[PDB]
């Protein structure tokens with residue numbers, strides 16, 4: 663149930679050949695045969711990669727093989743990666759290399775605590791749903807708009823690191839595989855998440871005074887076979903909340 667057209671898999675399609683590429687590469691992104699480097703380990707970069715077509719699956723699960731790694735000493739690295747399922751695509755900006763006031767879903771892999779009064783241990787993975795009205799407060803690591811999150815040790819690991827994002831029937835689940843255990847450990851599991859079909863998958867990274875290599879190695883999108891019993895492209899991104 664792999665959907666190849668919404669995936670990035672080695673050998674990358676159209677790279678070193680006449681075949682149709684499936685992704686657009688934007689900003690500081692460096693394309694090599696063995697990784698897509700959203701930013702090099704250099705300051706003040708914004709790079710992204712965006713699926714060349716929109717996704718109309720109602721129920722899906724994206725697996726991302728990524729690598730964040732750099733030569734910054736002690737805590738002097740940043741800023742992280744965002745994964746996107748959004749109305750718009752290709753616009754750079756302050757939100758891990760991509761535009762603010764976005765429409766849809768963001769999954770942030772934040773590696774630098776901008777918030778001087780933070781309670782979190784970094785890196786910190788969180789999710790945000792936006793109808794266009796919200797601005798991600800980068801200076802505060804998105805504190806005001808975070809729906810859920812978990813600390814996650816993903817930098818400079820000696821083995822492969824993966825993230826899974828599952829969306830089906832209003833349930834959004836983010837899982838990690840960072841500890842070389844060939845298993846999905848839960849990070850976030852929330853319900854009442856409303857997203858339309860017809861949005862774009864993408865990934866972006868950003869660096870400022872602090873930097874890191876932010877690599878995407880592969881992205882594999884799976885269609886979930888889930889029963890349904892409305893115009894799904896017109897659903898406004900939103901979240902419904904269980905009452906107290």
Ligand SMILES: OC[C@H]1O[C@H](O)[C@@H](O)[C@@H](O)[C@@H]1O
Nearest residue numbers: 740741776869870871872873
């Ligand atoms: O890179 C770390 C840091 O560098 C600068 O201070 C700014 O660009 C911040 O937004 C960024 O988070």
Ligand SMILES: [Ca+2]
Nearest residue numbers: 772774776803
């Ligand atoms: Ca941050």
Ligand SMILES: [Cl-]
Nearest residue numbers: 670671674675
């Ligand atoms: Cl590809």
Ligand SMILES: [Cl-]
Nearest residue numbers: 692699702703
């Ligand atoms: Cl490089």
Ligand SMILES: [Cl-]
Nearest residue numbers: 776800801802
């Ligand atoms: Cl800041």
Ligand SMILES: [Cl-]
Nearest residue numbers: 799804806807
């Ligand atoms: Cl915020």
Ligand SMILES: [Cl-]
Nearest residue numbers: 784785816817
């Ligand atoms: Cl770290």
Ligand SMILES: [Cl-]
Nearest residue numbers: 818819820821
């Ligand atoms: Cl390690």
Ligand SMILES: [Cl-]
Nearest residue numbers: 838839840847
């Ligand atoms: Cl893990």
